[PDB]
Amino acid sequence: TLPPAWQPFLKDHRISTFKNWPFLEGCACTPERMAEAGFIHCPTENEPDLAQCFFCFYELEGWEPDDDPIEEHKKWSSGCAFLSVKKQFEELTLGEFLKLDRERAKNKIAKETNNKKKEFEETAKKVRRAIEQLAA
Amino acid sequence: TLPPAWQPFLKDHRISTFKNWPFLEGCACTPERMAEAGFIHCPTENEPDLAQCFFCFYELEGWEPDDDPIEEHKKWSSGCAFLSVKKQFEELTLGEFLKLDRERAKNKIAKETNNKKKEFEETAKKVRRAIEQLAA
Amino acid sequence: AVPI
Ligand SMILES: [Zn+2]
Ligand SMILES: [Zn+2]
């Protein structure tokens, strides 16, 4: 039945993530071609526009009707391995797949360590200002 | 990784199931050779050496040192599709894998049905005998 | 081996 943690690899799943998504028929970035680029619908309130790649975890917003999801992706985060995947999911070898899933887990790690870093940087700046202000 | 429900497809996992397997070095039915045959160890107080195929769910006991788990399997239940897969697990395509797993899910159902049927015939035998006894 |  396929495990839930590994669904994002399934296009139909990615497509399904798009609920109340604008840009349909007549538009270049349809949920079909969004999922084709590896994108998921992760809409907030402050940006119901938000889509994120399931593999690299890059995030894009402000989508234009004429935007080509693949082209948008290649330019911003080219390093994403998924882009290089030309085979149908069901035509992937178990090894190939486990190799990919491995790299995904990796990318997810990198993402969160980056956020932990920015968070820490900010807190550091605040604390630094506070003590500085106390001088005087 | 791979979710638990699918771990039995992994040889090393099957091997792991053999805890306190008596037939070790020098034997033809080692945990390694048992696993290569698709067996996992399902020991009971009653049947300590009870092994079951993970794919076709056939169960064998009364193991002996010179037993070739493969020939045993092929002989008692040849129809098992796992026997026919010569490919290495990770050389499998996802389509091939999901295909197999579908048939396992089938085999499982078949197994459960045959079990329900056996306990049905058992309770039946009991009502029958009781009825006979009262008749006397 | 043998069936159960
Ligand atoms: Zn990506
Ligand atoms: Zn079998």
Describe the structure.
The structure holds 3 chains of a larger assembly. With 136 residues, chain A is mainly alpha-helical. Helix content of chain A is 46%, strand content 6%. Chain A has a single domain (1-136), classed as Orthogonal Bundle (Inhibitor Of Apoptosis Protein (2mihbC-IAP-1), Chain A). Chain A has helices at residues 11-17, 31-36, 69-76, 94-134, and strands at 39-41, 51-53, 59-60. A 3-stranded antiparallel beta sheet of chain A has the order 1-2-3. The longest helix of chain A has 41 residues, at 94-134. With 4 residues, chain C is mainly beta. In chain C, 0% of the residues lie in helices and 50% in strands. Chain C is built from no helices and 1 strand. Chain C starts with a strand and ends with a strand. The interface between A and B is medium-sized, with 14 and 14 residues. The structure holds zinc ion (2 copies). Chain C: This is Diablo IAP-binding mitochondrial protein, cleaved form. Chain C: A motif (IAP-binding) lies at residues 1-4. Chains A, B: The modification Phosphoserine is found at residue 16. Chains A, B: It is found in: Cytoplasm; Nucleus; Chromosome; Chromosome, Centromere.
In this entry the ligands are:
zinc ion
CATH fold assignment of chain A: Inhibitor Of Apoptosis Protein (2mihbC-IAP-1), Chain A
Structural class of chain C: mainly beta
Task: State the CATH class of chain A.
Answer: Mainly Alpha
Quote the beta fraction of chain C: over 45%
Figure out the total of helices of chain C: 0
Query: Main sheet of chain A, how many strands, which sense, barrel?
Result: 3 strands, antiparallel
